[PDB]
Design a protein around this ligand. Sequence first.
Ligand code: 7PJ
Ligand code: 7PJ
Lengths: 273, 264
Amino acid sequence: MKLFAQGTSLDLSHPHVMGILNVTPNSLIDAVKHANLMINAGATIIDVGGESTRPGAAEVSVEEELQRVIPVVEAIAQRFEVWISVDTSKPEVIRESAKVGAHIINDIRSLSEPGALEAAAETGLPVCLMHMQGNPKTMQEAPKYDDVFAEVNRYFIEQIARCEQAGIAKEKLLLDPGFGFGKNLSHNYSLLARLAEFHHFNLPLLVGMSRKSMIGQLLNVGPSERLSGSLACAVIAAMQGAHIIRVHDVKETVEAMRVVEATLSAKENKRYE
Amino acid sequence: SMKLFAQGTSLDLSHPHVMGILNVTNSLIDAVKHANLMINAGATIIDVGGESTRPGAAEVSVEEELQRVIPVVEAIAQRFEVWISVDTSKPEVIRESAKVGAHIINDIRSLSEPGALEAAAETGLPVCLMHMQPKYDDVFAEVNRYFIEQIARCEQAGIAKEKLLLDPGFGFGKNLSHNYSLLARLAEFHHFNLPLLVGMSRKSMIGQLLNVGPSERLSGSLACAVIAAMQGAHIIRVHDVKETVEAMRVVEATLSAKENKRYE
Ligand SMILES: Nc1nc2[nH]c(SCC(=O)O)nc2c(=O)[nH]1
Ligand SMILES: Nc1nc2[nH]c(SCC(=O)O)nc2c(=O)[nH]1
């Protein structure tokens, strides 16, 4: 399995580590310094995001998001060979990010915003479809599912069809069950335990559990104390054949992924279920 | 449902246990301080030996080994509720360790010394059967055959199956690829219906893979522990207790949400 964008390809025969580069508040110099460190630590994708996914923040204007995101995507694309994912829901940011070299559109809202689907289709870039119950402002009030796995799985079926209808072929899609997005602790572990069953779509799986409450609430530790839990999550998902792991702690995750790959390559069937 | 019994208590193996490595090196005060730190960090078993009992460490007389081991085992058994595994190959140390409260006999020489098997049998304690010998035809098959053989040998000596734990012996006469073959197939050793114990912490199977020194192997050691625990390994022997306990909690929460309670 492979993805193609901007004249290069990403080989998904082993797990990739995607480093988080938050550009919400010198800003450009600092972002590039951080990118450089993450690449050096072995990140093969850098996820650039300029709108907080937090509960009460006003949505950032299109002009402010462009100012935070585009110069950063641009500076990374012209210095490094790394893949760049852009964490946006706005069509204009999608368009302008593609123009300066972004490889993956990583929308937490799965292109639900007006125009976003058409803009993503126009760029021809890979698109990540992430499950979220409701919207970021209220999704954590009262998450509820009768069957969280089936509900997430159904969402993927629907969203795939929506993308295909807009001209975005299956081969461009990645799926992400959206850890922490309208999910309590037990919902998150039900999804993680069954993650391998999402392979039936024959699409790349991306996960992001790094430093999230599904670790914090389980261990009763603060946000700076979650590395060991974050590594355990990453390993659990990668052992089940997750293709991309989105993280804060790149060096440590890359090391863990090398251990996973050595294990998977000694296994006859290449996956745990 | 699987449990071990020793010294009037039991160990509930329905979730993964972290076994902390304790050096025996005043020595008593320090050993008890370290045991305390590991317990606080969430270790439920302390393995008494560490650097003093690694392969290649200097051999000592029976009297010297008794003088270093027995007071440590004794002091831990008197102060804490934790299980104690004792690293020894000598029958006298086996016997005297049992008398002062040890729960598990951990002999990396597999009770090969004269009288060791009979002494382990006499104690009635749990015994860890660890594979050691690198060339193999089929490393798994050899390690599996070794378990079959050592189980029979123990049973012949009067040590019932219910007392045994199996450990494939990562790093013990094994190159990098042998170690990963065993780790990838670890769940297949559940056919014996015995507890599985593993020790990969800071070993060359991480160092050689990552090209890092002994103090830089925590992330790799955690990955190893998680991989084994996801396959239903019952006990994980480690240097880095707090971090491993946290990783095991994550594994437990995942296994509990799974209808199968195991990865294969
Ligand atoms: N694709 C994807 N994108 C994300 N962006 C964030 S932001 C919240 C945080 O890092 O805590 N989470 C995710 C995720 O789980 N998947
Ligand atoms: N049961 C058991 N006991 C051990 N003692 C050592 S000493 C080598 C080291 O810690 O690097 N390893 C092991 C192991 O793998 N299993």
